[PDB]
Design a protein around this ligand. Structure first.
Ligand SMILES: CC(=O)N[C@@H]1[C@@H](O)[C@H](O[C@@H]2O[C@H](CO)[C@H](O)[C@H](O[C@]3(C(=O)O)C[C@H](O)[C@@H](NC(C)=O)[C@H]([C@H](O)[C@H](O)CO)O3)[C@H]2O)[C@@H](CO)O[C@H]1O
Ligand SMILES: CC(=O)N[C@H]1[C@H]([C@H](O)[C@H](O)CO)O[C@@](O[C@@H]2[C@@H](O)[C@H](O)O[C@H](CO)[C@@H]2O)(C(=O)O)C[C@@H]1O
Ligand SMILES: CC(=O)N[C@H]1[C@H]([C@H](O)[C@H](O)CO)O[C@@](O[C@@H]2[C@@H](O)[C@H](O)O[C@H](CO)[C@@H]2O)(C(=O)O)C[C@@H]1O
Ligand SMILES: *[C@@H]1O[C@H](CO)[C@@H](O)[C@H](O)[C@H]1NC(C)=O
Ligand SMILES: *[C@@H]1O[C@H](CO)[C@@H](O)[C@H](O)[C@H]1NC(C)=O
Ligand SMILES: *[C@@H]1O[C@H](CO)[C@@H](O)[C@H](O)[C@H]1NC(C)=O
Ligand SMILES: *[C@@H]1O[C@H](CO)[C@@H](O)[C@H](O)[C@H]1NC(C)=O
Ligand SMILES: [Ca+2]
Lengths: 172, 320, 320, 172, 172, 321
């Protein structure tokens, strides 16, 4: 897709992640864990809620009858009415189809971008202490315990703490 | 032996298909419908001072056809017309009928005002017919009077009747013209003289002459009573000059304010509210579009030629 | 220790709110309006050969009401009609009136051609009325002739008048029918015989019977003259067959070219140019939409039910 | 937003940058400096000018009156005209709303992309001589005077000139 | 452009690449070569085919005559038809213009994203064995013969195979 | 020196210009047209049971003008009317003419049903005229009868003719009123008596009087036969009461189903197929829009005020220097 993450370099979604739209899985000496990212999840949901507020709406225009259900109106004006109503319906049908197709394209690509923006944030946090896997993971070149992993998730990981030794581990 | 942190997204077992600009079969985690395809087979009338006319046709309210005896006056914000409703008891029709029906269906009520029309002793103003049954038997349109010669065969006298609108709003005046079944019948009711009915206000004028040419029986009657109508403005008069054939107004109508006319076969429901109606009932949906019918009235979703249009409410679904 | 280069973008202290697909309250650095809310309270006529009809009504140009004496012929690209303008000096109206008014209001001029109609010695063709004053004296519609019996009470003769369209373009022909207020008046003007007016061509056929009957005075007159019209194609003949009640054309009309019809009470301004007009004046905006009125003429922005719609002309505003 | 720079990893805009939409601030031994980027600024402005040229426009279709201002028209025809006009107005109001919402989303995201493309251009110029701090800045691991800073801004910076010095400082 | 590759950091297209939309050119000791990338090419083509399938169609609504070709119509009713038809045509002309402008914008930017996504895939595969030159190429810091180049194009390049020698050449 | 791998995209020597949201002059590798500019100057009738009326006007089908003899009955999905088509052989016209034409052009066929009208010894029902030629001889509208007195001068008898609709669908009935050229002519055909024609059904009634008088000659004839029509409902009857001047129906019409009416001068072509038509021919395009005509019928591309609208089918074209 447009931003290359969802249905892209991230191979698939996680059905087990039920408390958010985006998030983290990790591996260290203490074992494995999972945690949703609130901020990215809420950014995507808020944007979709905005579309719904816009779209799930009718006009407040009052329309009255120009066609009799139970009797015959003048044939000339009736044909004009039929032409007019059918033309109006073709326009709204076209508009409805275009609206939803365009919005769906954007929703999908917006969601893709929010994944990439989270990925990019973490990359910049880790700086020279980690390398990209190519499938959405970062291989961290120092011991990173649960509090260290938490520091990455909550955006307080300080790269300079581990830099000296991380660089040596990378160069080997 | 490097530790790692992996970025990922959610997915669901039951994905749903939407259309995009580039893909007809795009699976997403969640979607929601934008086209309403279900209706309530009921007229939702909560919060509406409504009138269900039943078998009474709107025009029958003005002339007072027996079927409309309970709807001769009223107030409403919503007027409901039903299929096969009765406007006429005696054979005939209204000139400019649809415009009259629509005008009644745009109103918020009807009031009635006496013309006070009086007639000489040689006129019988209580003419009735078997076609218009009320209570015991032979009756007539409640708001009109069938004028005939008291003495059978005698010339109906030259008569003048004028109605002034003494109100501050326009009044709707209706009258009829009787077209007899034969020359003999015409002579019996109105005499041998040439008949002429002239009507005139500041803004309206017309002449009517009863026709007697052979025509088939409608419920055993070859006679016809056709109706004509016009609006008389505040302070204006309408004069009827006639010598036989006029079906004269006893009362005139005043259409009160405005209201929503609905033509529907669906039964009433005072439990639910609605702003959008059609032949088959009410449309209460929040959705922008609707596939029930192109004929609706009120504040409605727009009709589209589509059963379903799903709006994605989530990312691409990518299962393992 | 390291030197640093920082990438950034501008911001403003006072940003503007716009709506996006996902956000109703999105602050951007700049934006511009797309819906015009203002109009000039004047008719901008620079570059237009315009005709302000004043109190002359367009239909009055064809029949020749005294108010329209200076507007019986001419050319223009813009025709301005004013409120309460006069078409009918004598009480009456035109059948299919709005169709005629719109036809005149899209022309670029009017020329007049003589019918050449002459009448026998038993017809007084110079009937006049106090309703249509000209030079302090009783007169009549300039392009028509009120035909009556020359001797009072005498039968108006069976008369035929045929106009040939000798031109290469279609001509618009009008005529009136007089509707007496009483039997005596009818007899005085046209005699006791039954009155009938027939008008026939290869493209038109119709019959008219004068309506005789008492009715309210309009400007002290109970009589009515109603007008009728049709087109006569090149080379075609239109024949009038009448024995009383016809108000006959002495001239017919030729509508020339194209023009823009404006109905407005706003004053003329020859200094400014415009292509879009409404009741309240002129709309000279470059914007795609407007909220002034759904009733406009010319080349206009589209009407929308919106006070404002702001188009972003800059990035998200993210202040310090 | 879609590209993650404006209202993203760049914390806020600069009110004091009045000669451009995008630009640079730097700090080196000799002091500080600021300069707008012309190319990215003009790229954004030209795209917005393109939209305005397309949008700020009416049709040349000449419409006549079909409703009399000063007289009553036929009731049945009037009802048809009212139905038709209100239907056309609902369509144009809807199209107007959608147009400006869609264009506003794109304008904002386009501007975000121009910020990111400038950032990316600078990243690739600097190569192994600098590191990203996560805030839209690059920490340059060699002495970069005003001439050197100008070369980064004007896309003439030769990384190989400083690479030996920079790699030694990065590894330390 | 939005994703910065096509008409961006890629200076120009290759007229000689006639069997694909995107692809590779290499240089090693054995010489040069060129090859199209099938997957990215097909991703772009399929999305454009998708648009064509949606856009190249008409409605199945049957319209009948409301204007007689060989006879006159009442002037008022004729004027209502003319106003309505011209109003409908202004809507469709506007809609057509907006559709094609919006689609053209998206097609161009979609094609840009597929170029970038291919670039990003190759970047992450090469990992620490190569460096970006800023013009869409990767300088590979080890001997990479024809089979090695093929493994990069085929998404089977093992970075760990060449890492030791590559890092020595990068550090020098 | 490092080995290199470079990523790129294709270009072409001959790019095409398209318009985007932000750029009027955007060069792309390929594009395709969305607005059709070409029409076939021919009516494409393949797969259609079509009727080309030729010189026959739709109203002529119901009254049976000689030009319409091969179009008195039939079935069709498409009915084609031509310019200057003939409805009336004798001078005159139909009241409510355009509504009738429209009704016929909306139909998918016509059936004809006998009225069963009969006339006594004193009526000559075989009146003909040089204005309506058929087989080199004087004739008349095939579906009507010109009734005159058998003895010239004698009063046309008071006559009653009633048609009952015995069908389950409505029938369209037409009749004429002869308006003689002079008082002398009126007396020869119908007698000195005053004339009156009444017509009455359950849903319709009207009266007609032959207007007599001199008027301009149409093909050497000052007389006129003007036509009227109505619908007779299933089970209803319609009664004509007359004593001279009635042109009586010998058959009534039944309009069958629905069809597509086309008004065009373009020739028929059964080799090509189409669902969209206009005065100048057929629009066979697959494209969504067209600039040929705002006046179209059938299933059509939408008319737009545009010569060309190019849809991009490729990336930005960035050629080599
Ligand atoms: C004359 C003959 O042998 N046969 C029929 C004859 O049956 C029929 O006449 C009508 O028959 C019906 C039968 O229900 C009524 O009796 C009609 O009478 C009334 C009516 O009820 O409508 C009586 C009423 O008092 C009259 N009212 C007034 C105000 O005059 C009316 C009135 O005269 C007529 O309705 C006016 O048209 O009639 C009776 O007329 C006729 C049907 O046309 O046909 C004969 O051949
Ligand atoms: C051509 C003709 O007969 N003109 C008369 C005119 C008509 O007879 C009348 O309008 C037909 O309806 O009548 C004129 O006289 C008027 C009187 O009829 C009326 O009673 O009082 C009027 C004064 O308020 C007026 O005098 C007219 O309309 O002026 C006289 C005219 O010659
Ligand atoms: C049914 C009948 O009487 N038919 C006549 C016909 C009519 O009398 C006439 O059309 C009624 O208006 O007239 C025919 O002859 C014509 C003459 O009446 C007319 O004066 O001159 C005509 C030559 O231009 C012509 O001769 C006719 O129309 O053919 C004779 C027909 O039997
Ligand atoms: C209008 O459309 C309805 C539904 O298709 C149809 O029944 C009706 O005949 C049409 N009206 C006219 C006047 O043809
Ligand atoms: C799916 O979308 C609908 C509509 O926005 C929403 O109400 C519902 O909660 C969503 N479901 C989930 C599981 O998020
Ligand atoms: C049409 O709308 C106008 C303005 O809202 C209103 O005054 C008029 O009554 C309406 N026309 C009819 C025939 O109801
Ligand atoms: C409607 O438009 C057509 C085509 O421009 C024109 O020929 C015709 O005169 C117009 N009709 C009226 C009533 O102005
Ligand atoms: Ca016009």
């Amino acid at each position: 897709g447009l931003f290359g993450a969802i249905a892209g370099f991230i191979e698939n979604g996680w059905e087990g992640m039920v408390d958010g739209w985006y998030g983290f899985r990790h591996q260290n000496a203490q074992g494995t864990g999972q945690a949703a990212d609130y901020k990215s999840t809420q950014a995507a949901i808020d944007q979709i809620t905005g579309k719904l507020n816009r779209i799930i709406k009718k006009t407040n225009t009052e329309f009255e009858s120009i066609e009799s259900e139970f009797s015959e109106i003048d044939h000339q004006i009736g044909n004009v009415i039929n032409w007019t109503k059918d033309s109006i319906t073709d326009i709204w049908t076209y508009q409805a189809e275009l609206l939803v197709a365009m919005e769906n394209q954007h929703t999908i690509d917006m969601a893709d971008s929010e994944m990439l923006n989270l990925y990019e944030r973490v990359r910049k946090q880790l700086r020279q202490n980690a390398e990209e896997d190519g499938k959405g993971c970062f291989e961290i070149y120092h011991a990173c315990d649960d509090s260290c992993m938490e520091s990455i998730r909550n955006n307080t990981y300080d790269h300079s703490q581990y830099r000296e030794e991380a660089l040596l581990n990378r160069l080997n | 032996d490097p530790d790692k942190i992996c970025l990922g997204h959610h997915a669901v077992a039951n994905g749903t298909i939407v259309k995009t600009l580039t893909n007809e079969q795009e699976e997403v985690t969640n979607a929601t419908e934008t086209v309403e395809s279900t209706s309530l087979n009921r007229l939702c009338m909560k919060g509406r001072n409504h009138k269900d006319l039943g078998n009474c046709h709107p025009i029958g309210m003005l002339i007072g056809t027996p079927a409309c005896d309970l709807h001769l006056t009223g107030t409403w914000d919503t007027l409901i017309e039903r299929k096969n409703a009765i406007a006429y008891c005696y054979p005939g029709a209204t000139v400019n009928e649809e415009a009259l029906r629509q005008k009644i269906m745009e109103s918020g009520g009807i009031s009635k005002i006496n013309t006070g029309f009086t007639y000489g002793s040689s006129i019988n103003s209580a003419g009735t017919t078997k076609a218009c049954m009320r209570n015991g038997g032979n009756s007539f349109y409640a708001e009109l009077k069938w004028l005939v010669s008291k003495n059978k065969g005698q010339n109906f006298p030259q008569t003048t009747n004028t109605y002034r609108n003494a109100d501050t709003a326009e009044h709707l005046i209706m009258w009829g013209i009787h077209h007899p079944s034969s020359t003999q019948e015409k002579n019996d009711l109105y005499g041998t003289q040439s008949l002429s009915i002239s009507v005139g206000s500041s803004t309206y004028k017309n002449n009517f002459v009863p026709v007697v040419g052979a025509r088939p029986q409608v419920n055993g009657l070859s006679g016809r009573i056709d109706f004509h109508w016009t609006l008389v403005q505040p302070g204006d008069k309408i004069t009827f000059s006639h010598n036989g054939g006029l079906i004269a107004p006893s009362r005139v109508s005043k259409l009160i304010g405005r209201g929503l006319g609905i033509q529907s076969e669906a039964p009433i429901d005072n439990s639910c509210e609605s702003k959008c109606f059609w032949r088959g009932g009410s449309i209460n949906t929040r959705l922008p579009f609707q596939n029930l019918s192109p004929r609706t009235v009120g504040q409605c979703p727009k009709y589209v030629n589509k059963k379903s249009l799903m709006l994605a409410t989530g990312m691409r679904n990518v299962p393992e």
